[PDB]
Amino acid sequence: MMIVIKTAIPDVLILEPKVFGDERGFFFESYNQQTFEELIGRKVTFVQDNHSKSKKNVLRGLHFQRGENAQGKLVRCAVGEVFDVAVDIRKESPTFGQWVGVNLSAENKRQLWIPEGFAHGFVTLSEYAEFLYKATNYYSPSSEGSILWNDEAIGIEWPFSQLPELSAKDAAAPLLDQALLTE
Amino acid sequence: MMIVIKTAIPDVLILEPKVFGDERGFFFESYNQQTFEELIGRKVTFVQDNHSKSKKNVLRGLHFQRGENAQGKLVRCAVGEVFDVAVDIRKESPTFGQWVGVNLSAENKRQLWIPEGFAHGFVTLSEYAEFLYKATNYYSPSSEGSILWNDEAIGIEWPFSQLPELSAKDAAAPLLDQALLTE
C-alpha cells in the first residue's frame, strides 16, 4: 500500500510504498493512474519517463518550464539516495518562494509529487544515485527555466557542506527574482 | 539514435533508447507517449507502473490477463540483468505458441514491448535484478491466467543452467493446452 504524507507546502506530497521484503525479493505498484488521479483530485497524464545517473555531490537543478509547458513531476530514486527539493514559484501563492526537501532513496522508496508551479532540484548523497521521474508534459528547451541552488530568498538547507558539482548551466543559473522576471 | 528492433514475432518490439552519457553519469528518456504511439501506430495508455526485485534464478512468469483486462506491457531492467520472454497466445495468430527471448539489463537499457495477446515471463541472470513494468490495464486477479515456465508446446529455451526458483503460484501454473486463454 502507499502512505501519502503532506509536506509543509500543501500541494507537494510524499508517497511511500510500504513493501513486502519477501524471499524472492519484492514487488510493488510504483504508480497507478486511477489511484493517483483520485488522490490529487484532478485528471493528470504523464507523458514522459526519464532515468538519470549522478555521482555523489552532483547537484542537478532548480529547473522548471514556463506557462503551458509547465510540468508536474512525480519522482523517486531507483538506486542510492538523493535529497530532493521543490520550490513554489507561483508569484500569487501564499507559499511562494518556500521550499520542501525530502530524502528519496532506493531503500525508503519515497516519491515526491511536485505540481506545475514549482522548480525542482536534487543532490546525490550516495556514491552514485539513479533518479527516475515522470512528467505531465514534454521537456522543451525553449521553455527551460532555472534558479541558482543557493539562492538566499528561497534559502534551501542543503545537507552537504562542500560546494556541489554543478553543470555549467546550473552554476550560471540566475537568482529567484531574475529567474522569474517574465513570469 | 533510438533503436526499435523487430523480433521474429511481428508485434513484439525491442526498444533501445537514446542514452546521453557514461557508465557513471547519464540521462535518457525511458518512455515518451507521442513517440511510442507513433511507433505502434495506435493510441496506447499505460495506467500502471510496477517495480520488482528478484534474486538470481528467480523466474517469474508466464502471466497474462484475459479478454478486456488483457494488458500490453513495456518492460525494462533498471538493475542487473534478466532474460525476458513473450509468448504469443492468440489462438488465431499465425505465430501462436511462438516465443521471443531477449536479455534486458541495466547496462544495455533494452526494453521489450509485449502487446495484449501475449504471456510474459523472465528469469533473473544477475545476483539480483530490479525489473520495471508499465501496463496498459490494471492487474486483475479474476482475469489472470498463467502458463508453466517449462511448457513443452511452447518450448522456451531458458539460458540459465540451474533450476529456477518459482513462487508457489507460478510453480502451479498449468500447461499451455490447459491454460485459460479465453474468457
From Swiss-Prot, chains A, B:
Pathway: Carbohydrate biosynthesis; dTDP-L-rhamnose biosynthesis; Bacterial outer membrane biogenesis; LPS O-antigen biosynthesis. It comes from the Bacteria. It is an enzyme of class 5 (isomerase). Its EC number is 5.1.3.13. The record marks Y139 as: Participates in a stacking interaction with the thymidine ring of dTDP-4-oxo-6-deoxyglucose. Changing H63A: Loss of epimerase activity. One of its GO terms (biological process) is polysaccharide biosynthetic process. Substrate binds at R24, E29, Q48, D49, N50, R60, K73, H120, E144, K169. The active site is at H63 (proton acceptor), Y133 (proton donor). It holds the Pfam family dTDP_sugar_isom. The keyword Repressor does not apply. One of its GO terms (cellular component) is cytosol. It catalyses: dTDP-4-dehydro-6-deoxy-alpha-D-glucose = dTDP-4-dehydro-beta-L-rhamnose. This is dTDP-4-dehydrorhamnose 3,5-epimerase. It comes from Salmonella typhimurium (strain LT2 / SGSC1412 / ATCC 700720). The gene is rfbC.
